[PDB]
Amino acid sequence: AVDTAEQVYISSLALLKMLKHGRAGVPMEVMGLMLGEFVDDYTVRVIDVFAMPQSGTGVSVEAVDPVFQAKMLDMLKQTGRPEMVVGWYHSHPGFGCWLSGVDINTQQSFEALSERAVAVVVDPIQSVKGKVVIDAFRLINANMMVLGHEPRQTTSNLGHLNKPSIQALIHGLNRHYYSITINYRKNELEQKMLLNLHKKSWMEGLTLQDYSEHCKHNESVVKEMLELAKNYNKAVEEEDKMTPEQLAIKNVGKQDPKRHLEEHVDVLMTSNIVQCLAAMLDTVVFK
Amino acid sequence: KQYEKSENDLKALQSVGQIVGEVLKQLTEEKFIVKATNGPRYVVGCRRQL
Amino acid sequence: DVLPPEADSSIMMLTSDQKPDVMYADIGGMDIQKQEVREAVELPLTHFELYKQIGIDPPRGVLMYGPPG
Amino acid sequence: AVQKVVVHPLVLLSVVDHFNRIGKVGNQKRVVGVLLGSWQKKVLDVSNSFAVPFDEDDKDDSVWFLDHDYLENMYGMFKKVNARERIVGWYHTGPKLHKNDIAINELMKRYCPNSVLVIIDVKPKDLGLPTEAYISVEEVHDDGTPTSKTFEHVTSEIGAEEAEEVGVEHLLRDIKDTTVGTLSQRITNQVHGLKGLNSKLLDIRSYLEKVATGKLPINHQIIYQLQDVFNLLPDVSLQEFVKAFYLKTNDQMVVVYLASLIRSVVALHNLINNKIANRDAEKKEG
Ligand SMILES: [Zn+2]
C-alpha cells in the first residue's frame, strides 16, 4: 500500500527475552507481547519485552488477557518506565519463519488498534552464532489492490529485504507480508561491560586462581597426557612415513585415496599448551 | 450446558495429530534419535519438562 | 553430519543381566562338542596371536545342527 | 550451603536497563531489584530478575521500602508463565554494601530459606570480575558477641546457555584476538599479575588505613589469623625446590623434540608439494 521507509529499532534486553522464552517452550509457538514507543512515521523503537502466559496444549493458539494487560502495565507504571505497546511476537521453531494462518488471523484483529504494530518472529533453532534471526513482518490489505502498493522510500531497505530470504512459500508470502529492516544500537557502557563479562569473566575470580591451577596441572596430570602424546607420535608416525612414499607411488597428487591423514598438528598444539603452561610455572610460583 | 460442552468441542477442534514412534537411543543431552513406525529414522529434540 | 555407531542390535548385546544362568557342569557328557565349540569360539577370542604364529587361519562362522532336543 | 552461584547475562542486562529506568529521576536513588533463579544443587542457578520499589532518604538513614504486594502479584505472573522458575533472592547496584543492606535479606528470609544477594556494578570501571554474591551466616565470636549475623561471599562467574550463547556471541561482533591456543590465555596472563596487584594495593591501603582511622579497627580476629596464614605460606626454600628444575628440563624436553622433529618435517613436506606444483606448472605455463 502506501509505504514509508522501513526501519525497526531494538533494545538489547529484547533479543535475550525473545530467545529465552522462545527456547523454554520450543515445540509450541509461544505468544509474547512487545513494548516500546512509536517515535515517528518510519522508525519504531521497542524498549521492553514481557512474555505472555500459556494455555491449553496446542500449537500457535494465542490470547491477550486484558486483566494481565492492566496488571502488567500497572506494574510497569510503578516501574520506572511506563510506555505504549508496539506489537507482539512468537516463534516458528522448525522452519523458515513465515507467519501462519493463525498469525494473520490475530493480525487482522490486532491491526485495528494500531497501524504499525509490527509482528516479529524469533527463531532459536535456525540461528547458531552468526544469526539473530530477527525476522519481522507487516500485513497488507486486500481493499487496496485496485490501487498500487509501491512507493518504497529509501530503496536500499527492500533490496536488502530480498537477500535474507529463501523459500517457495516465502516467495508465495510476499503477498500479505512485506518485511521491515531491523538494526541494532548498543550502549558503549553496555557494550564495554558485556565485553567486561565476556572477555574478563570467562577468566575466573581473582584471575590468579585458574592459572595457578594450570600450574598444578603441569607437574601432576600433564605427564599422563604426555605419555598419550608420545604414544600417538610414535604410532601415527610409522605409518605416516608411508605417506610421501605412496605420494611418489600413485600419482602427482590425485584424489583422496583413503582414511587417515597426518593429524600431527593438533597433537603438537596440545604440546604447545604443555610448554606455555610450563612457562606459567616460573611466573606464578616465583613471586 | 449444550453451549458449554459444544464450546469445549469448539476449542478442541484445533488439536493436531502427533506421530507415534520409538526411541532408538540417546545421542547427547538434547539430541535424540528415534524411529518412525511407518518408515524412516529421524534425529529429534525434547521438551524442557520431560 | 556423521553419527556415532548406533541403530539397535534388537536391543544391544544384553547389557547387564540378560544371562541365561546356565553353568558349565549343568551340561552333561558333551565333551567333544563342548571342547570343539570352545576351541572354535572361546579360544580364538583370547589367544589370537597364537593363530598368527602357528598358521591355523581360525574360522569365521560356526554352524551347529541336530535333531530337536 | 552454596557451592557457587551461576549468573547469566540476562539478569545483568536486566540491571543495566533498570538503571536506565530510574536514571531520569536521578536525584538520590540506588538500583535495587529482586532476583530469580533455581536451586539446582550445592551450585546455584540464576535465570531471570525484575524490579522493586525502593527509596532511602538522608535523615535517620534506615528508611527502606520493600513492597510485599508487588512481589506477590508479579511473582504470581512469573510463576504463572513459568513453573520451573521460582525465587532465590535479591540484588542491588552495589557500589559496596552499606549498613542498611541486611534488612532486605532479613525481610525476605521468609520467602527463600537462604535468600542470596548479588552485588554488581553498572559502571564498568571495575577491572575485576563483577557480580559479587554474598550469603548471610552467623559466626558467634569468642568475645561473647550474642549473634554476629554477617554476609559472606560465595564465588561467582558468568555461566552459559545455548540460546544466550547465540544472543551474546552475536551481540558482540567486536573483538576476537584469541585464535584459541598458546595465546588465548596470555592477555589473561597479564591480567592475573595485574589483578593480583590491584587486590594487593587494596590490601596495603587497608593496612595503612586501619592504623590511622577506625579508631583501632584493625579486624581484631581475622587480621592476626589470616596474616599469619600469609606469613606461614611463602615457600622460597632452596633444598629441592631447586630440584624441580630437571622436571622443568623434562617439561622443556618433550616439546623441544616434538617441535624440532615434526614441525620442520611438516613444513618441509609442504615445501615439497609447493615446489612440485610450482615447477610442474611452470613448465606448462612458460
Ligand atoms: Zn506462527
XYZ file of C-alpha atoms and ligand atoms in Angstrom:
693
model
C 0.000 0.000 0.000
C 1.261 3.464 0.815
C 4.616 2.590 2.368
C 7.323 4.535 4.160
C 10.987 3.887 4.907
C 11.301 0.529 6.634
C 13.171 0.619 9.947
C 12.845 -1.176 13.303
C 14.930 -0.303 16.350
C 15.612 -2.661 19.244
C 16.506 -2.925 22.850
C 19.330 -5.219 23.865
C 17.164 -6.884 26.532
C 14.556 -7.649 23.871
C 16.596 -10.185 21.886
C 17.527 -12.040 25.067
C 13.914 -12.244 26.250
C 12.964 -13.432 22.747
C 15.499 -16.261 22.684
C 14.925 -17.375 26.284
C 11.151 -17.522 26.124
C 11.151 -18.988 22.638
C 13.590 -21.643 23.743
C 11.898 -22.626 27.008
C 8.660 -23.615 25.266
C 10.195 -24.665 21.985
C 7.893 -27.190 20.201
C 4.795 -24.985 20.601
C 4.616 -21.415 19.345
C 4.892 -19.244 22.446
C 2.940 -15.988 22.492
C 4.622 -12.832 23.704
C 3.836 -9.123 23.685
C 6.187 -6.330 22.704
C 6.570 -2.931 24.318
C 8.149 0.293 23.141
C 7.476 3.699 21.632
C 6.219 4.938 18.263
C 8.705 7.750 17.764
C 7.768 8.726 14.207
C 6.461 7.631 10.811
C 9.235 5.262 9.788
C 11.255 4.175 12.851
C 9.764 2.089 15.648
C 11.633 1.614 18.914
C 10.931 -1.425 21.058
C 12.412 -0.898 24.512
C 10.823 -3.632 26.636
C 9.662 -7.225 26.236
C 7.382 -9.196 28.543
C 6.182 -12.672 27.654
C 2.597 -13.868 27.676
C 1.315 -16.744 29.809
C 0.481 -20.045 28.165
C -2.752 -22.001 27.980
C -4.025 -25.300 26.558
C -1.528 -27.550 24.934
C -1.838 -26.680 21.262
C 0.344 -25.140 18.532
C 0.094 -21.447 17.595
C -3.025 -20.616 19.618
C -2.762 -17.183 21.210
C -4.632 -14.881 23.585
C -4.398 -11.454 25.237
C -5.801 -11.499 28.772
C -6.884 -7.893 29.447
C -6.536 -8.213 33.215
C -2.984 -9.335 32.504
C -2.666 -6.202 30.355
C -3.969 -3.949 33.120
C -1.892 -5.524 35.880
C 1.313 -5.809 33.822
C 1.117 -2.239 32.550
C 0.222 -1.173 36.098
C 3.403 -2.779 37.412
C 5.326 -1.069 34.638
C 3.731 2.215 35.691
C 5.079 1.694 39.186
C 8.245 0.529 37.491
C 10.385 3.409 36.230
C 9.128 3.348 32.630
C 5.515 3.073 31.500
C 5.156 3.140 27.728
C 2.925 2.068 24.855
C 2.557 -1.424 23.422
C 4.078 -1.782 19.954
C 3.195 -5.284 18.856
C 3.929 -8.870 19.709
C 5.907 -11.955 18.766
C 6.134 -15.725 18.674
C 8.350 -18.361 17.062
C 8.282 -20.597 14.001
C 10.729 -23.013 15.573
C 11.150 -25.678 12.945
C 11.069 -23.760 9.699
C 11.951 -20.690 7.652
C 9.826 -18.375 9.788
C 6.725 -17.215 7.914
C 3.582 -16.034 9.641
C 0.943 -18.759 9.610
C -2.816 -18.555 9.161
C -3.384 -18.096 12.895
C -0.754 -15.357 12.796
C -2.507 -13.373 10.076
C -5.799 -14.160 11.874
C -4.699 -12.403 15.035
C -3.084 -9.734 12.864
C -6.277 -8.610 11.150
C -7.912 -8.259 14.567
C -4.870 -6.617 16.133
C -4.303 -4.123 13.307
C -7.483 -2.176 14.093
C -5.887 -0.930 17.328
C -2.500 0.148 15.975
C -1.258 0.913 12.492
C 2.416 -0.070 12.583
C 2.330 -2.622 15.393
C 4.906 -4.892 13.825
C 4.727 -8.680 14.099
C 8.163 -10.137 14.925
C 9.373 -13.760 14.748
C 12.305 -15.101 16.738
C 13.788 -18.469 15.922
C 16.099 -20.164 18.444
C 16.856 -23.053 16.042
C 17.869 -21.636 12.644
C 20.347 -19.312 14.431
C 23.630 -20.692 15.765
C 26.051 -17.839 16.480
C 26.030 -15.514 13.500
C 22.281 -15.129 13.056
C 19.735 -13.438 15.280
C 17.417 -14.343 13.269
C 15.204 -11.382 13.955
C 12.591 -11.562 11.165
C 9.747 -9.056 11.364
C 6.767 -8.561 9.086
C 3.888 -6.298 8.167
C 0.444 -7.193 6.857
C -1.119 -5.832 3.665
C -4.828 -5.333 2.981
C -6.972 -6.595 0.112
C -9.076 -3.469 -0.466
C -6.123 -1.508 -1.859
C -5.239 -3.916 -4.663
C -7.093 -1.616 -7.033
C -4.504 0.992 -6.051
C -0.767 0.341 -6.113
C 1.466 -0.849 -3.286
C 4.818 0.534 -4.379
C 6.265 3.871 -3.126
C 9.003 2.138 -1.001
C 11.057 5.156 0.085
C 14.791 4.647 0.812
C 15.047 1.846 -1.786
C 18.035 0.110 -0.087
C 15.814 -1.481 2.557
C 13.742 -3.501 0.056
C 16.746 -4.821 -1.875
C 18.197 -5.653 1.496
C 14.962 -7.489 2.404
C 15.139 -9.791 -0.611
C 18.552 -11.147 0.329
C 17.693 -12.711 3.831
C 15.270 -14.864 2.265
C 14.590 -18.381 0.992
C 11.709 -20.451 0.018
C 8.940 -21.191 -2.373
C 6.471 -20.277 0.383
C 8.073 -17.004 1.479
C 8.005 -16.263 -2.246
C 4.325 -17.130 -2.006
C 4.028 -14.860 1.038
C 5.477 -11.721 -0.446
C 1.782 -11.119 -0.839
C 0.079 -10.386 2.536
C 3.516 -9.667 4.017
C 6.202 -7.117 3.441
C 9.020 -7.175 5.939
C 10.857 -4.322 7.621
C 14.544 -3.815 8.398
C 15.833 -4.412 11.908
C 19.059 -2.894 13.190
C 20.913 -2.617 16.464
C 22.199 0.276 18.528
C 24.349 -0.572 21.518
C 25.268 1.395 24.614
C 29.047 1.685 24.814
C 28.549 1.382 28.564
C 26.617 -1.828 27.941
C 28.965 -2.909 25.140
C 32.011 -2.346 27.316
C 30.536 -4.104 30.336
C 29.372 -7.021 28.224
C 32.964 -7.016 26.989
C 33.956 -6.977 30.682
C 31.713 -10.002 31.262
C 32.661 -11.998 28.214
C 36.344 -11.153 27.852
C 37.078 -10.923 31.606
C 34.550 -13.193 33.363
C 35.490 -16.121 31.194
C 38.688 -15.636 33.095
C 37.769 -16.509 36.620
C 37.798 -14.861 40.014
C 40.924 -13.062 41.324
C 42.450 -14.233 37.976
C 45.492 -15.908 39.552
C 43.399 -18.857 40.556
C 42.979 -20.878 37.396
C 46.451 -20.069 36.109
C 47.974 -21.369 39.307
C 45.635 -24.352 38.834
C 47.228 -24.863 35.413
C 50.497 -24.745 37.326
C 49.027 -27.517 39.487
C 48.295 -29.475 36.315
C 51.820 -29.049 34.909
C 53.512 -31.404 37.403
C 50.851 -33.985 38.167
C 48.484 -34.519 35.249
C 50.382 -33.377 32.132
C 52.841 -36.291 32.155
C 49.989 -38.753 31.593
C 48.749 -36.922 28.526
C 52.419 -36.506 27.604
C 52.600 -40.310 27.571
C 49.482 -40.331 25.411
C 51.096 -37.745 23.128
C 54.312 -39.746 22.811
C 52.445 -42.962 22.015
C 50.390 -41.165 19.373
C 53.521 -39.545 17.958
C 55.079 -42.949 17.528
C 52.106 -44.963 16.274
C 50.717 -42.402 13.830
C 54.217 -41.612 12.601
C 55.440 -45.024 11.488
C 52.510 -45.212 9.064
C 52.568 -41.560 8.015
C 56.104 -42.152 6.829
C 54.473 -44.405 4.258
C 52.644 -41.311 3.012
C 55.356 -39.483 0.947
C 56.436 -42.892 -0.371
C 52.924 -43.545 -1.621
C 52.726 -39.954 -2.905
C 55.699 -40.855 -5.075
C 53.992 -44.148 -5.939
C 50.442 -43.373 -7.022
C 50.296 -40.063 -8.974
C 51.270 -36.395 -8.707
C 48.617 -35.537 -6.130
C 45.321 -37.046 -7.312
C 42.018 -37.632 -5.444
C 41.713 -38.774 -1.833
C 42.676 -42.473 -1.587
C 41.610 -43.411 1.939
C 41.031 -42.654 5.624
C 43.981 -41.350 7.538
C 45.950 -38.124 7.348
C 48.899 -36.632 9.211
C 46.823 -35.060 12.074
C 50.023 -34.281 13.967
C 49.473 -30.519 14.078
C 46.720 -30.811 16.685
C 48.837 -33.018 18.950
C 51.677 -30.524 18.590
C 49.331 -27.699 19.588
C 48.491 -29.680 22.716
C 52.233 -29.931 23.308
C 52.373 -26.151 22.891
C 49.747 -25.918 25.625
C 52.117 -28.087 27.685
C 55.048 -25.726 27.148
C 53.106 -22.499 27.701
C 51.621 -23.727 30.930
C 55.085 -24.941 31.914
C 56.238 -21.365 31.314
C 53.417 -20.355 33.642
C 55.170 -22.315 36.425
C 58.125 -19.952 36.904
C 55.976 -16.838 36.594
C 53.256 -17.899 39.028
C 55.290 -19.951 41.521
C 58.064 -17.411 41.880
C 56.724 -14.171 43.356
C -24.606 -26.802 29.119
C -25.060 -27.682 25.449
C -23.206 -24.455 24.640
C -20.609 -25.332 27.292
C -19.814 -28.853 26.065
C -20.034 -27.796 22.417
C -17.802 -24.792 23.144
C -15.335 -27.190 24.733
C -15.615 -29.073 21.442
C -15.219 -25.752 19.595
C -11.956 -25.107 21.424
C -10.957 -28.741 20.968
C -11.351 -28.656 17.164
C -7.851 -27.135 16.846
C -5.810 -30.042 18.201
C -3.224 -31.660 15.936
C -2.447 -35.337 15.476
C 1.025 -36.420 16.510
C 3.447 -39.011 15.190
C 3.925 -42.258 17.110
C 7.455 -43.619 17.265
C 10.076 -45.373 19.347
C 13.424 -44.127 20.638
C 16.477 -45.974 19.392
C 18.955 -44.309 21.754
C 20.156 -41.026 23.215
C 22.858 -39.098 21.389
C 23.514 -36.077 23.636
C 21.773 -34.183 26.422
C 19.413 -32.722 23.809
C 19.828 -34.807 20.649
C 17.623 -37.869 20.443
C 17.413 -40.499 17.735
C 14.071 -42.164 17.129
C 12.395 -44.331 14.508
C 9.013 -43.641 12.980
C 6.976 -46.836 12.864
C 5.694 -46.216 9.330
C 9.100 -45.662 7.812
C 12.277 -43.668 8.233
C 14.542 -42.734 11.121
C 14.964 -39.226 12.500
C 17.013 -37.092 14.881
C 14.837 -35.091 17.238
C 14.746 -32.998 20.393
C 12.744 -32.990 23.593
C 10.678 -30.544 25.565
C 12.012 -28.873 28.685
C 9.860 -30.795 31.194
C 10.266 -34.378 30.050
C 26.992 -34.924 9.927
C 28.362 -38.303 10.994
C 26.758 -40.371 13.606
C 28.389 -42.475 16.307
C 27.729 -46.223 15.937
C 24.169 -46.958 16.960
C 20.940 -48.407 15.477
C 19.961 -51.260 17.825
C 21.042 -54.878 17.580
C 17.493 -55.796 18.659
C 18.305 -54.075 21.862
C 22.098 -54.178 22.123
C 24.316 -57.034 23.465
C 22.030 -57.802 26.526
C 23.837 -55.029 28.510
C 23.715 -56.256 32.109
C 21.747 -59.176 33.333
C 20.021 -60.949 30.484
C 22.140 -64.058 31.064
C 20.502 -67.480 30.761
C 22.101 -68.529 34.098
C 23.435 -71.868 32.831
C 26.749 -73.183 34.112
C 29.414 -75.489 32.723
C 28.662 -78.630 34.752
C 24.939 -78.243 34.010
C 25.644 -79.743 30.595
C 26.256 -83.459 30.951
C 28.588 -85.507 28.779
C 29.181 -83.402 25.680
C 32.953 -83.316 25.897
C 33.936 -83.416 22.223
C 31.226 -80.932 21.304
C 31.748 -78.538 24.228
C 35.505 -78.737 23.681
C 35.155 -78.100 19.940
C 32.803 -75.139 20.407
C 35.307 -73.866 22.979
C 38.247 -74.075 20.565
C 36.135 -72.589 17.771
C 34.660 -69.639 19.663
C 36.016 -69.012 23.140
C 39.645 -69.869 22.460
C 40.315 -67.529 19.463
C 38.616 -64.776 21.468
C 41.666 -64.687 23.767
C 44.694 -66.446 22.242
C 44.508 -64.505 18.997
C 48.255 -64.258 18.446
C 48.894 -67.995 18.645
C 46.912 -68.434 15.430
C 49.045 -65.809 13.709
C 52.205 -67.690 14.685
C 51.185 -71.310 14.132
C 49.393 -70.543 10.880
C 46.000 -72.048 11.576
C 43.570 -69.497 9.995
C 40.858 -69.753 12.658
C 37.362 -69.841 11.181
C 34.866 -67.019 10.891
C 31.490 -68.677 11.445
C 30.482 -71.969 13.029
C 27.309 -73.964 12.391
C 25.532 -76.363 14.733
C 22.729 -78.759 13.874
C 20.984 -81.893 15.040
C 17.581 -83.371 15.834
C 15.300 -81.232 18.006
C 16.025 -81.932 21.641
C 25.411 -24.365 51.826
C 26.219 -22.939 48.389
C 28.965 -24.129 46.063
C 28.842 -21.078 43.779
C 26.200 -19.033 42.020
C 25.890 -19.022 38.240
C 24.829 -15.652 36.864
C 23.581 -15.372 33.322
C 23.988 -12.252 31.141
C 20.230 -11.645 31.022
C 19.953 -10.623 34.665
C 22.953 -8.278 34.389
C 21.424 -6.582 31.357
C 18.190 -6.581 33.390
C 20.056 -4.492 35.949
C 21.544 -2.129 33.357
C 18.148 -1.402 31.812
C 16.758 -0.933 35.344
C 19.353 1.748 35.965
C 18.151 3.184 32.667
C 14.591 3.011 34.080
C 15.397 5.055 37.158
C 18.093 7.218 35.590
C 15.630 10.020 34.881
C 14.686 10.746 38.495
C 18.424 10.937 39.131
C 18.403 12.823 42.457
C 19.285 10.143 45.028
C 18.420 6.563 44.139
C 20.361 3.330 44.092
C 19.326 0.445 41.869
C 17.554 -2.314 43.827
C 15.697 -5.300 42.408
C 14.590 -8.892 43.046
C 16.491 -11.982 41.900
C 15.013 -15.123 40.344
C 16.707 -18.463 39.847
C 16.745 -22.198 40.502
C 18.303 -24.051 43.399
C 19.983 -26.640 41.197
C 22.488 -28.287 43.521
C 25.009 -27.042 46.027
C 25.738 -24.887 42.953
C 23.113 -22.205 42.315
C 21.395 -21.186 39.082
C 20.055 -17.778 38.029
C 17.664 -17.259 35.125
C 15.514 -14.140 35.484
C 15.013 -10.988 37.592
C 12.839 -7.891 37.841
C 12.356 -4.630 39.727
C 11.056 -3.483 43.134
C 10.124 -0.056 44.524
C 12.719 1.173 46.999
C 13.910 4.541 48.319
C 16.143 5.925 51.062
C 16.397 9.466 52.438
C 19.086 11.371 54.340
C 17.858 11.970 57.908
C 17.582 8.788 60.016
C 19.116 6.760 57.211
C 17.322 3.472 57.954
C 14.266 4.275 55.837
C 13.741 1.463 53.367
C 10.812 0.001 51.455
C 10.100 -3.462 50.105
C 6.658 -3.848 48.574
C 5.392 -7.277 49.513
C 2.340 -6.928 47.280
C 4.358 -6.109 44.153
C 6.385 -9.236 44.927
C 3.195 -11.283 45.441
C 1.408 -10.397 42.228
C 4.440 -10.175 39.950
C 5.828 -13.441 41.286
C 2.336 -14.749 40.589
C 2.797 -13.592 36.997
C 6.228 -15.159 36.608
C 5.123 -18.358 38.328
C 2.053 -18.339 36.074
C 4.151 -18.198 32.925
C 6.982 -20.444 34.209
C 6.618 -23.046 36.948
C 10.231 -24.174 36.657
C 11.211 -20.676 37.765
C 10.918 -19.531 41.378
C 12.556 -17.035 43.713
C 16.084 -17.399 45.024
C 16.879 -13.920 46.359
C 17.502 -10.280 45.540
C 20.116 -7.813 44.343
C 21.048 -4.163 44.275
C 23.510 -1.940 42.436
C 26.298 -2.417 44.982
C 28.882 0.321 44.975
C 29.588 -1.545 48.188
C 27.196 -2.753 50.875
C 26.189 -0.174 53.442
C 24.729 -0.656 56.932
C 21.088 -0.861 55.808
C 21.954 -3.780 53.497
C 20.969 -6.501 55.969
C 17.322 -5.578 56.464
C 16.352 -6.553 52.916
C 17.535 -10.118 53.471
C 16.015 -10.060 56.942
C 12.698 -9.222 55.318
C 12.754 -11.810 52.567
C 14.203 -14.725 54.519
C 10.524 -15.674 54.864
C 10.427 -16.232 51.091
C 13.669 -18.014 50.349
C 15.287 -20.075 53.139
C 18.719 -18.879 52.032
C 17.940 -15.575 50.335
C 21.125 -14.916 48.398
C 22.103 -11.440 47.199
C 24.023 -10.208 44.160
C 26.277 -7.145 44.102
C 27.096 -5.861 40.614
C 28.476 -2.662 39.181
C 26.656 -0.716 36.480
C 29.817 1.342 35.970
C 32.437 -0.984 34.441
C 35.438 0.802 35.906
C 35.929 -2.476 37.782
C 38.883 -4.221 36.196
C 37.932 -7.172 38.381
C 35.142 -9.682 37.982
C 31.656 -8.208 38.557
C 28.540 -9.904 40.010
C 29.723 -10.384 43.544
C 27.399 -12.511 45.686
C 27.189 -12.767 49.478
C 25.236 -15.007 51.821
C 24.361 -14.308 55.457
C 25.604 -16.708 58.130
C 26.492 -16.458 61.828
C 29.972 -16.800 63.290
C 29.348 -16.169 67.012
C 32.537 -14.849 68.471
C 34.942 -15.790 71.265
C 34.414 -12.298 72.753
C 30.842 -13.263 73.579
C 29.065 -11.277 70.931
C 25.455 -12.531 71.148
C 24.904 -13.170 67.443
C 27.055 -11.703 64.692
C 24.960 -12.083 61.531
C 27.410 -11.401 58.724
C 27.129 -11.745 54.976
C 29.839 -13.937 53.493
C 30.823 -14.163 49.854
C 30.442 -17.310 47.805
C 32.239 -17.177 44.457
C 30.537 -16.335 41.186
C 31.016 -16.199 37.434
C 29.009 -15.910 34.218
C 27.544 -19.185 33.005
C 26.370 -20.401 29.639
C 23.142 -21.377 27.918
C 22.649 -22.383 24.291
C 20.266 -19.595 23.300
C 22.052 -16.910 25.315
C 25.226 -18.032 23.539
C 23.558 -17.093 20.235
C 22.473 -13.812 21.791
C 25.698 -12.666 23.450
C 28.057 -14.054 20.807
C 26.074 -12.217 18.170
C 25.739 -9.001 20.182
C 29.498 -8.668 20.439
C 30.971 -8.754 16.883
C 33.644 -6.506 18.433
C 36.883 -8.150 19.484
C 38.456 -11.540 18.851
C 42.228 -11.821 19.207
C 42.245 -15.294 20.711
C 42.742 -17.852 17.895
C 42.417 -20.173 20.860
C 45.714 -21.868 21.583
C 49.013 -20.632 23.021
C 47.789 -17.032 23.066
C 44.148 -17.070 24.149
C 45.492 -17.115 27.715
C 48.291 -14.540 27.552
C 46.026 -11.485 27.760
C 44.649 -13.035 30.912
C 48.258 -13.779 31.862
C 48.838 -10.046 32.017
C 45.500 -9.880 33.844
C 46.456 -12.330 36.595
C 49.570 -10.438 37.638
C 47.896 -7.039 37.312
C 44.804 -8.208 39.182
C 46.832 -9.655 41.951
C 48.425 -6.236 42.066
C 45.133 -4.359 42.372
C 43.961 -6.599 45.211
C 47.301 -6.258 46.977
C 47.072 -2.496 46.537
C 43.716 -2.668 48.322
C 45.489 -4.765 50.965
C 48.299 -2.289 51.642
C 45.841 0.617 51.553
C 43.659 -1.146 54.119
C 46.676 -1.951 56.317
C 47.831 1.662 56.276
C 44.256 2.840 56.832
C 43.493 0.709 59.899
C 46.364 2.294 61.802
C 45.112 5.805 61.068
C 41.313 5.549 61.285
C 38.657 3.148 62.510
C 39.928 4.242 65.986
C 41.539 0.771 66.409
C 39.575 -1.194 63.730
C 42.373 -3.481 62.720
C 39.955 -6.564 62.253
C 40.894 -7.861 65.719
C 40.421 -11.555 64.845
C 40.991 -12.088 61.164
C 43.972 -9.789 60.946
C 46.363 -11.902 63.008
C 44.794 -15.183 61.931
C 44.894 -14.709 58.196
C 48.036 -12.574 58.395
C 49.866 -15.482 59.978
C 48.315 -17.677 57.297
C 50.044 -15.327 54.853
C 53.211 -15.483 56.970
C 53.105 -19.275 57.034
C 52.969 -19.925 53.314
C 55.527 -18.013 51.125
C 57.761 -21.043 50.418
C 61.034 -19.763 48.971
C 63.202 -22.635 50.290
C 66.113 -23.966 48.292
C 66.733 -27.626 49.079
C 64.689 -29.435 46.415
C 62.632 -26.544 45.083
C 65.848 -26.056 43.130
C 65.475 -29.730 42.159
C 62.150 -29.215 40.478
C 64.129 -27.794 37.610
C 65.165 -31.006 35.976
C 61.459 -31.709 35.878
C 61.354 -28.258 34.290
C 64.018 -29.533 31.893
C 61.724 -32.510 31.268
C 58.859 -30.086 30.582
C 61.127 -28.423 28.051
C 62.322 -31.789 26.691
C 59.115 -33.208 25.201
C 58.020 -30.016 23.499
C 61.525 -29.302 22.182
C 61.787 -32.633 20.486
C 58.192 -32.677 19.236
C 58.655 -29.208 17.704
C 62.176 -29.800 16.342
C 61.250 -33.123 14.793
C 57.751 -32.808 13.447
C 57.361 -29.056 12.718
C 60.331 -28.988 10.351
C 59.210 -32.185 8.611
C 55.656 -30.932 8.027
C 56.824 -27.536 6.742
C 59.375 -29.328 4.553
C 56.686 -31.631 3.133
C 54.591 -28.595 2.296
C 57.659 -27.103 0.593
C 57.888 -30.345 -1.412
C 54.273 -30.042 -2.546
C 54.644 -26.326 -3.320
C 57.804 -26.715 -5.373
C 56.453 -29.731 -7.282
C 53.291 -27.834 -8.202
C 55.458 -24.768 -8.849
C 57.903 -26.226 -11.366
C 55.452 -28.658 -12.980
C 53.035 -25.817 -13.672
C 55.967 -23.590 -14.642
C 56.993 -25.967 -17.415
C 53.384 -25.957 -18.668
C 52.823 -22.202 -18.267
C 56.034 -20.739 -19.672
Zn 3.456 -18.991 13.824
